């Protein structure tokens, strides 16, 4: 009965994820599941050390996701 | 689950998982123990009372409910 999180507003958008342990990440959304695990293109890591770390396509478990901010205008 | 339908509109005190206190009028609940409390005042420790309003407390962070006062008129 697990409905998907309502995120076609946020598809192909530049979002900054907040992750669990005070962590942060940035990237383009590419999709989801009903469990809100997000797949991300052009992922820049953006740690608290201050230097920005690009990766690319990553997958983030939805358990660890605190918030999405759409940095791009939806 | 009439054990908390017995407690609707009673002014209840909800101790939370961080230790914060929600003294609010117990309006509604569900199977996940998400509470709807109206006119809810938060009590934290140094004492201060912080009025919030209609709090939708998610059930994950609720520890313990207890009655503070009878339902108002």
């Amino acid at each position: 009965k697990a409905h998907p999180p309502e995120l076609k507003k946020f598809m192909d958008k530049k979002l900054s994820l907040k992750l669990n342990g005070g962590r942060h990440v940035q990237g383009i959304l590419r999709g989801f599941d009903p469990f809100m695990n997000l797949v991300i293109d052009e992922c820049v890591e953006m740690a608290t050390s201050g230097q920005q770390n690009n990766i690319g396509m990553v997958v983030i478990r939805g358990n660890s996701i605190i918030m999405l901010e759409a940095l791009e205008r939806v | 689950s009439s054990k908390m339908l017995q407690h609707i509109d009673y002014r209840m005190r909800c101790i939370l998982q961080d230790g914060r206190i929600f003294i609010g009028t117990f309006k509604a609940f569900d199977k996940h123990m998400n509470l709807i409390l109206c006119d809810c005042d938060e009590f934290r420790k140094r004492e201060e009372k912080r009025v919030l309003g209609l709090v939708l407390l998610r059930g994950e962070n609720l520890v313990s409910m207890t009655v503070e006062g009878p339902p108002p008129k």
């Binding site: 599941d33 997000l38 990553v58 478990r61 | -």
Partner: protein
């Protein structure tokens, strides 16, 4: 549009250098060669290794079954 477990299947099809983050453990991440997933994102890694951020002594683990309830983020290299 990519759904995530399809990209996990593409990761094992690529047998990439998957670095997996941890829930609540921001210091230690784990490199690995991904082989298998399931319904609940449990991941087996062939040459997995612990990387700290203060220590940064990469310890080799072998093929692990890291539980789905512990991972945060599957990056590559």
């Amino acid at each position: 549009m990519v759904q995530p477990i399809n990209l996990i299947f593409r990761y094992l099809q690529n047998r990439s250098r998957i670095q997996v983050w941890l829930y609540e453990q921001v210091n230690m991440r784990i490199e690995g060669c991904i082989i298998g997933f399931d319904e609940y994102m449990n991941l087996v890694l062939d040459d997995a290794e612990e990387i700290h951020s203060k220590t940064k002594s990469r310890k080799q683990l072998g093929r692990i079954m890291l539980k789905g309830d512990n991972i945060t983020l599957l990056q590559s290299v």
